[PDB]
Symmetry: C2
Subunit: 187 residues, 2 copies
């Protein structure tokens, strides 16, 4: 049985925050669906890399549930995730079934928007801290990767390998994470 990941890709997403987890999860043997928030059409990311999703979110949501739901960052991408009723329902359903939710950089601010995981320790990009902390619903961390039960968060493009490997460890174990890590040539 392979584990399955849903990566929700919106216009303005940070392309590094998107691609590094997709690639590293696929190296781990996870079945990853890159789902376009707005449909199946190509998505223009924050630094103008254009990525073609595997499916629309409308279609991918009918194929779950997923062992992890991943929210990339990019301020405008996270804003789009935060405004979507479909994303709200996916995350609420994932939380209710005790499934992992992973978000990086500005991505965790969509958790706030959707009232997901309140009372958890979280990290974000430093510039997203004030947005995430509005109302005091989370406890903040400066760790590069933070995991408080089912809520897994991380800080930025430069923490995206660590983030992705933490997802891999959570789903497929420490040994698979270590095996996937070595050929990456990480610090």
């Amino acid at each position: 049985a392979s584990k399955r990941a849903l990566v929700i890709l919106a216009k303005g997403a940070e392309e590094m925050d998107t691609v590094i987890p997709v690639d590293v999860m696929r190296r781990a043997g996870i079945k990853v669906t890159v789902a376009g928030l707005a449909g199946k059409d190509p998505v223009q990311c924050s630094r103008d890399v254009v990525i073609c999703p595997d499916a629309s979110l409308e279609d991918a949501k009918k194929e779950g549930p997923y062992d992890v739901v991943v929210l990339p960052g990019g301020n405008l991408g996270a804003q789009n995730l935060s405004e979507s009723a479909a994303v709200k329902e996916i995350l609420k359903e994932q939380e209710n079934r005790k499934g992992l939710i992973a978000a990086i950089c500005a991505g965790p601010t969509a958790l706030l928007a959707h009232e997901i995981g309140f009372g958890s320790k979280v990290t974000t990009h430093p510039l997203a801290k004030d947005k995430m902390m509005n109302g005091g619903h989370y406890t903040y961390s400066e760790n590069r990767v933070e995991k408080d039960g089912l809520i897994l968060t991380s800080r930025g493009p430069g923490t995206s390998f660590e983030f992705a490997l933490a997802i891999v460890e959570a789903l497929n174990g420490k040994e698979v994470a270590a095996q996937v890590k070595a050929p990456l040539v990480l610090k």
Copy 2:
């Protein structure tokens, strides 16, 4: 005047090796053209991320010269780069005009194929060393980023931020590289 980069994107390219330099160079104010080797159509990368190029290589080559030519890795992507007469002519012209050439992971093996930069110190992914060193035309290094004049090389996805920032330093200087680096949240 902004500096310009040509990133040559072939089927089977490593998507992390591709996207991290494109994004980081754009953060540095470099004008980056992601050029599809085979045409303008979307490119299926090694871990199945599909990237839409900005232009075909046929068109982008008519718009140079470029201040850097970047060759991503991925074994099958590097093989495609190595087999292309267009890539041979671009790299030969770049070498002749004393322009920077940057290649990561398996990417440097296309330099060997095209007889570019012989006599330079280079690095590659560890698994690409034997291919790169066939004939002894380069001197090998285990540094995470190696630069020997105009030939700039690096090892893997996990060295791609360092690689990209070395390109930025070469084109736009140390201060711009440091400014771009800080918001990335690197180790």
